[PDB]
């Protein structure tokens, strides 16, 4: 068909958003976020969970696609997550028509809590010790916080999951702390610097 000829030259993301010209804003995420893979759909179910750093081999978009089916009511549903991801990407490209990939990457870069904190047992005296956060660890924490805020949005609201996800992604791209993930990153930095 016509879109078959269109995608025959440029392998866009589902032939609706270009899978090129994606940029990572924040530093310390190069080789921690997979954005160099030209693919068609985020369901490449090859064996990547076996190793530690092979989890960075899957795309962060495919990581969020796995994060959609993270609930008792939906653990193991694939095409529901894929269609919801396509709807959320269309909602992002409607709210911000630059690129769903670029806007999502900007939100991921702006939703990162740069510091961490640990509770040390101390032999019976727990204390708050500020510690660093690893690159893939920070990326996974941001993705998890975003998916959790999106899931917590659709508790008493007729809004679609794609709609709440796009609203949280817009709040994270703005960094306005109007989403749970951005509020969580701000509170995490505040707590880490509270006991630095």
């Amino acid at each position: 068909p016509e879109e078959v000829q269109q995608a025959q030259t440029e392998i866009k993301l589902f032939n609706k958003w270009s899978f090129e010209e994606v940029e990572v804003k924040d530093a310390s995420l190069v080789d921690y976020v997979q954005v160099r893979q030209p693919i068609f759909v985020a369901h490449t179910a090859g064996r990547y969970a076996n190793k530690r750093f092979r989890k960075a081999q899957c795309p962060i978009i495919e990581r969020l696609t796995n994060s959609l089916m993270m609930n008792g009511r939906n653990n193991g549903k694939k095409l529901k997550a894929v269609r919801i991801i396509k709807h959320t990407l269309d909602i992002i490209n409607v709210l911000t028509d630059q690129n769903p990939i670029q806007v999502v990457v900007d939100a991921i870069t702006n939703t990162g809590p740069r510091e961490d904190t640990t509770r040390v047992g101390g032999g019976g005296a727990a204390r708050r010790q500020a510690v660093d956060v690893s690159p893939l660890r920070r990326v996974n924490q941001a993705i998890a916080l975003l998916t959790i805020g999106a899931r917590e949005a659709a508790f008493r609201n007729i809004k679609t999951i794609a709609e709440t996800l796009a609203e949280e992604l817009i709040n994270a791209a703005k960094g306005s702390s109007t989403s749970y993930a951005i509020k969580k990153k701000d509170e995490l930095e505040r707590v880490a610097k509270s006991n630095r």
């Binding site: 530690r52 040390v120 500020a130 690893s134 690159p135």
Partner: protein, 63 residues
């Protein structure tokens, strides 16, 4: 408050502490002279990159 960047030179070994957090030697990515041990909690490796919110803070043995 611009947090600098740091490339880990190597993961510092024998850092006895609570399981989950480890001291690792990182030289700052802003300048390759500022190098210090830092307490990283996430799953990390060597020759990676990270954000350091403190300039001259250095990790110690945390028992």
């Amino acid at each position: 408050t611009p947090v600098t960047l740091a490339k880990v030179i190597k993961v510092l070994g024998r850092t006895g502490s609570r399981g989950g957090v480890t001291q690792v030697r990182v030289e700052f990515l802003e300048d390759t002279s500022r190098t210090i041990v830092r307490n990283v909690k996430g799953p990390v490796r060597e020759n990676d990159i990270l954000v350091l919110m403190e300039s001259e803070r250095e990790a110690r043995r945390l028992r």
